[PDB]
Structures are given as C-alpha cells and as structure tokens.
Design an enzyme around this catalytic site. Structure first.
Site, PDB file in Angstrom:
ATOM      1  N   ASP A  86       1.221  -1.550   0.009  1.00 55.42           N
ATOM      2  CA  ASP A  86      -0.265  -0.077   0.291  1.00 55.42           C
ATOM      3  C   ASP A  86       0.973   1.697   0.287  1.00 55.42           C
ATOM      4  OD1 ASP A  86      -1.877   1.190  -0.445  1.00 55.42           O
ATOM      5  OD2 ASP A  86      -3.460   1.088   2.173  1.00 55.42           O
ATOM      6  N   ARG A 108      -0.762   8.872   1.350  1.00 56.01           N
ATOM      7  CA  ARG A 108      -1.249   9.191   1.927  1.00 56.01           C
ATOM      8  C   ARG A 108      -0.768   8.415   3.202  1.00 56.01           C
ATOM      9  NH1 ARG A 108      -3.708   6.062  -1.220  1.00 56.01           N
ATOM     10  NH2 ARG A 108      -3.760   3.870  -0.937  1.00 56.01           N
ATOM     11  N   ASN A 109      -0.398   7.537   3.064  1.00 58.29           N
ATOM     12  CA  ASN A 109       0.601   5.791   4.058  1.00 58.29           C
ATOM     13  C   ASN A 109       2.352   6.532   3.516  1.00 58.29           C
ATOM     14  OD1 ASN A 109      -1.615   4.805   3.634  1.00 58.29           O
ATOM     15  ND2 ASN A 109      -0.940   4.126   2.254  1.00 58.29           N
ATOM     16  N   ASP A 136       2.011   2.593   7.485  1.00 60.10           N
ATOM     17  CA  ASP A 136       0.191   1.769   7.820  1.00 60.10           C
ATOM     18  C   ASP A 136       1.316   0.585   6.643  1.00 60.10           C
ATOM     19  OD1 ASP A 136      -1.875   0.974   6.615  1.00 60.10           O
ATOM     20  OD2 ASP A 136      -1.667   1.912   4.701  1.00 60.10           O
TER      21      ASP A 136
END
Ligand code: Q6G
Ligand code: Q6G
Lengths: 279, 286
Positions: free
Chosen positions: B148, B152-153, B166
């Site tokens: 992922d 955002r991570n 994450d």
C-alpha cells in the site's frame, strides 16, 4: 484473475438499465470505499414515470475486494425475491462507473430507526417482536435458497414504508481472512472460519439484542480482541432492561457453542408468532 | 515481548488525528518511554468497536513488522499495550501529518510551490521521493513488500523527514520472492501494479509501480491519480497499454522514471537502488 473476468463479463439485458433514465440525487450514506445516493429512474421494470430508488456505487479509492463485493451483491440479488429482502431493480454497466439500482427504504437502517426512536417515535414491544419476525421470515427464505448472509446486523437491515423490514448488504454473503465485525460473528466463525446457516442464527441473536436495546452497541465496553477468550469460556451478554425472560431465552439459544443446539430460522419465527398472539 | 510491551497507566490518549470505519489514530503521550524522562508525545494506532478479524490481524501484522525494521525513513515503533485492554500500538508523532495532506496544504498555504517549511521547490519534492526510495530499498532488502505504497501512507516528520507508515497490508517474501493471495486484495486499484491486479502477484517490483504512482502524486502536489476514471475501467486501460499523462510541474527525465516504474513486464522496471541513483542525479544537476 477472478475479478477481471467478472468485470469483463458484467461490462459485456433483463437487469441492464439505461443510464439516461437515471437521475442521481442526495447522498443517503457514505464511507471511504463507496456510497449510496437517492435517485429517480424513468421506466424502471415497466413502471409509469419516475420510480424512487437507491443507487449503490464505489468511490475512486475502491479496492478489488470492494469491487468484488458489489458484483457479488448483484449476483446474489438476481437470484432472490422476498418481501423482507432488498429488491434489486437492475444496474448501469455501459455508461461510466458501475451502479446498482435497489429499492428506496424511507426510514433508512434499522440501527438509525431504533436510535431515533424512544421507550415503550412510538414503538411498543409488539412492534419490536414484529421487526424480529420479518427478519426471521427473510432469513428463513435465504436459508432455504442455500445462502449464508454472514453480516447479519441492524446496520444491514433497512426499514421501508409501513415499517417493513428489508435485509440488505449481500456483499459478503456466500452460497452452499473474514471481514465481518467480531461482535456479530459466531464462535466457530472466529476459531474455525466456518460460516453456515447456524452462524447466521448467532448473528440474529446479536441483531435481536440490538432491537430490544433500541440500537445499542453489543458487548459494551469490551474490545473485540478479548471476545475470543470470553465466548470460549462461556460468557454471554446479560439480559438487558425492558426484555422478557422468553425473549432472552431465545438470545441465549442463538448463542450456543454447538451449532446443532441452536434454533433454526423456522423455530425463531414460531417463537415470535407465539409471543405476538399471547399479548 | 519485554522489549515492546508498555504500561497502560503511563499512556494518556488525546484527540483523533485520523479515522476510518475499521480503525483510528489518536495523539497521545507516554510517561517513562524507553528510558526517556517524563512525557514523550506519540501517536497511538487502535481498532474501533466494529473491528473484524482481518483488521485485528492487520494491526498485529503491522506491529510484528515494525519490531524487525529500523530506518530513518520508516515510522518508528516505540511499543504497544496488548495485555488486559484494547490493542494499542505506540508510534512516533509526525507533526506535518501525511504527505498527501502536506502537499495539498501547500496549494492553499503559503509560500507554497515555487517551481520556510511550507515553501516547496522542485528540489524539495525530489528530496521527498529519494527518502522514500531509500526506505523502500531497505524494506526490499528485508524481503518485505509494503503493498500500500501511497502519499496518504507517507508521514512528514519534523525537519520534513519522510516516514513510510501503514504496514497493516505489508507481507514477507523470503521464499520465492513473491506474495500470492488467492482472494482479492484490499489495496486501492489505482495504486496496484498490473500483475497485482490481474494475477494477484505482489513483489518488490509491484512496490516500484506503486512508487511511480507516489511520484505522480508528489509532482502534482497531492493529486488524485487517473483523475475522472473509475477503478473498474482501469483493468482495460492498463491491459491495453495506457498510463497517466505527464503532469505540468514534471521534467522529461522525471516522467521517464514514472514510465519505467509502470512497465508491463516486472523485470524491465528499475529496482529501488536504481531509482535512488536517478533522484541523486536529478538533484545535483538542478
Ligand atoms: C461494495 O460497495 C459498497 C459498500 C458499502 C457502501 C456504503 N456503506 C456505508 C456503510 C455501507 C452501507 N451504507 C448505506 C448507505 C445508505 C443506505 C440507505 C439509506 C437510506 O436512508 C433514508 C434516510 C435518509 C435515513 O431517510 C435509504 N436507503 N434505501 C436503500 C439504501 C441502501 N443501500 C438506503 C444504507 N446503507 C453506508 C456502498 N457501496
Ligand atoms: C489495522 O489497524 C488500523 C489500520 C489503519 C488505521 C488508521 N487508518 C486511517 C487510514 C489509516 C491511517 N490513518 C492515519 C491517521 C493518523 C495519522 C497521523 C496523522 C498525523 O497528523 C498530524 C496533524 C493532524 C497533521 O497535525 C500525525 N501522525 N503521527 C503518527 C501518525 C500515525 N499513524 C499520524 C496517519 N494515519 C487513518 C488504524 N488502525
């Protein structure tokens, strides 16, 4: 893979709705993965004029599992027809994002309906027994069709006009790791990964607890990590306030360790029929 | 674990820093944390009351990975409260939040993108990319697919230090150099590689594809990849050979690195050591 084959097969006649006839309106609910919007559908399944519907769709950050869930929900809802199961009207697959057109339930989820409502909106104990029975009738039908719902909970019951209960959210339902919240899962589902009709019975017992508490949170102040040990040792939720002894005995029977010792959905319906008539 | 277990009485939870349907992050503070004196400000990763087994497994998987990994550009685990209560993971607080949020702020907030800490140049964006590629090179050496990898991570710590975070979906790949999943993934479709989407294969070279998408986000200042395209249509587009067009703040050299990251055959993609070398060469020439 499996999904690319399904997406290709779904994108490509009975269930295909023209996109020009659909007019999307306000958002009925939303997450990070996807959303439901109120809409109107012109000439839906031979109807006159505009038919009010709900339109299920994905958001731009949707994963494969969420896309598979939507197609899985479409595939199940084609095969089912019952007054207390959500009606699929059809789907838009030829114009833009993949939309599923389902029936509009004016009062929303059963969780929200009960939390808005007060003590015995005027709802009586007869009305709460009536809601339980309608869901049990829908689950009796689904059990006859060899279909485990898996995610049976108050958030996934919709409340239609005339307070008619509608089972919804068939993304995780299967024919005959897991993504069902731990507090609604049966003990064999937690430990052994087994999902049967009798694991839906456990989940119905939790749904019954929600109905009687007026949309309460099950196992309150207990994290789901601790629930493996508690259910293994034999602990269950206590009898809530404004709950009968007969109603609580039905919950405790739903939460038996051995799935064979639990009641079937035919038995649950018969108990609720007997509760109604005696009042 | 004696190393990683923290007393629950010493942790004091505060405001929510972010939330989903499954889980939550709160700002907190830890008394007497790892031989420090007094209170140390931290972030606490936890589950919500409606959590599933897969979400509980993901948190434990993230905890297990963060024990084994140590890098200046990977989020630091301090510890965890896991005995008699909800499962909490204590990680480092990154003052500027996610890289997506930081770059989207630099549109509205000033001095913004030019071409002190909020004033961003193209050299600073190349620096952010390089730190992530350095961290991903290390994780690739540990036989660990992140899966992922997105803006955002990536978290933005003090001194604008990039921190990969994450690790709920991250998996081990010692044997066979690949992670294969029978069922469907929980990574958003627009960040997944073509072999990950079609064939369910996750390697270090599928993280390279995802890094190419992260590069596109960095250059566009937190833009949404494949804009105005639903993820259902992305199966056909990637199969036919379509990729994202060159954004406006992007050089020809930088776009050639993105196109190399998005090659169909995973062997033809560059490794994370090669990506770091390209970004080093881009920096010095500017
Ligand atoms: C896989 O694709 C998915 C998955 C989940 C979702 C949306 N999720 C979040 C949690 C789950 C279910 N969501 C909703 C949203 C709206 C409704 C809903 C709400 C609703 O509300 C009436 C009102 C506004 C309270 O008066 C009426 N109707 N009628 C049909 C549906 C459906 N479906 C509804 C039910 N669940 C909210 C969308 N696509
Ligand atoms: C498996 O269990 C899980 C999985 C995911 C999650 C939380 N999820 C939702 C999406 C993913 C990641 N989430 C967050 C929330 C807050 C932050 C965060 C935000 C943040 O922002 C500071 C601010 C608000 C800009 O001032 C600082 N820090 N420091 C450490 C973290 C961490 N972790 C943060 C990062 N990710 C929100 C919880 N449990």
């Amino acid at each position: 893979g499996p999904l690319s084959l399904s997406v290709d097969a779904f994108k490509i006649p009975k269930w295909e709705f023209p996109r020009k006839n659909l007019v999307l309106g306000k958002t009925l609910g939303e997450g990070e993965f996807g959303k439901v919007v109120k809409a109107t559908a012109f000439h839906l399944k031979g109807r006159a004029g505009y038919t009010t519907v709900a339109v299920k769709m994905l958001k731009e950050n949707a994963s494969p599992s969420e896309l598979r869930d939507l197609l899985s929900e479409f595939n199940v809802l084609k095969q089912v027809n019952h007054p207390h199961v959500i009606k699929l009207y059809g789907a838009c697959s030829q114009d833009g994002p993949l939309l599923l057109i389902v029936e509009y339930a004016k009062y929303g989820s059963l969780r929200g309906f009960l939390r808005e409502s007060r003590k015995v909106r005027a709802l009586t104990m007869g009305d709460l027994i009536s809601f339980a029975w309608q869901i049990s009738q829908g689950m009796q039908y689904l059990a006859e069709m060899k279909l485990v719902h898996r995610d049976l909970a108050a958030r996934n019951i919709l409340v239609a006009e005339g307070r008619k209960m509608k089972i919804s959210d068939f993304g995780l339902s299967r024919d005959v790791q897991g993504r069902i919240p731990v507090k609604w899962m049966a003990i064999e589902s937690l430990f052994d990964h087994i999902y049967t009709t009798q694991s839906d019975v456990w989940s119905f017992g939790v749904l019954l607890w929600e109905i009687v508490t007026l949309g309460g949170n099950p196992y309150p102040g207990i994290p789901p990590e601790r629930l493996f040990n508690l259910l293994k040792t034999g602990h269950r939720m206590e009898r809530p306030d404004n709950c009968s002894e007969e109603m609580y005995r039905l919950m405790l029977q739903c939460w038996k360790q051995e799935p064979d010792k639990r009641p079937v959905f035919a038995d649950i319906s018969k108990d609720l029929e007997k509760m109604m008539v005696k009042r």
